[PDB]
């Protein structure tokens, strides 16, 4: 990978943040379409860190969400922005 | 307003869908930044339809989310796409 990871806003353990970056790297190598990248990441996080996660992947969006404490990350990987958080 | 509403995917009562469009119309008239539009819509839906809602507003994004039955809408209003759903 030559993609630069830049974590913009996180409320999350360091190991979980690293796992989000690693998971997104695998998603981007397999899939080109944003919704497919998002589904890969969401499903992995549901498995490793319990339901219920939600994932948005894109180049132009804003958001207002509610998340469980310690289960939120917003980061860039290359030119793609990724929002990943747990609620409900 | 001259913005065209196109509901792409909804699991939601007709009246709630109309309220999402009306709320987003008010948000777009007041605010220019996607995150501020999203916050306006999320807060109105938490008030009218109970917590906990999440809102994404943008022109380029894909998503994979989990939502409570009958509480999901994805729609365009003008050139902006809006994802609004309840979870947790």
């Amino acid at each position: 990978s030559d993609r630069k990871a830049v974590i913009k806003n996180a409320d999350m353990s360091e190991e979980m943040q690293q796992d989000a970056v690693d998971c997104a790297t695998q998603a981007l190598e397999k899939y080109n379409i944003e919704k497919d990248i998002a589904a890969y990441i969401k499903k992995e996080f549901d498995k490793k860190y319990n339901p219920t996660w939600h994932c948005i992947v894109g180049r132009n969006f804003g958001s207002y969400v509610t998340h469980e404490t310690r289960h939120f990350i917003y980061f860039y990987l290359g030119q793609v922005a990724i929002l990943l958080f747990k609620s409900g | 307003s001259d913005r065209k509403a196109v509901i792409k995917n909804a699991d939601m009562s007709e009246e709630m869908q109309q309220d999402a469009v009306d709320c987003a119309t008010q948000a777009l008239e007041k605010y220019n930044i996607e995150k501020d539009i999203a916050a306006y819509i999320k807060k109105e839906f938490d008030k009218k339809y109970n917590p906990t809602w999440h809102c994404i507003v943008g022109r380029n994004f894909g998503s994979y989310v989990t939502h409570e039955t009958r509480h999901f809408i994805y729609f365009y209003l003008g050139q902006v796409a809006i994802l609004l759903f309840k979870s947790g």
Binding site: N9, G62, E68, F72, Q79 | K35
Partner: peptide, 14 residues
């Protein structure tokens, strides 16, 4: 609440 909080994100032009 200590169990949850709201968060905002906004992509930036680069």
């Amino acid at each position: 609440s200590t169990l949850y909080k709201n968060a905002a994100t906004q992509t930036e032009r680069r």
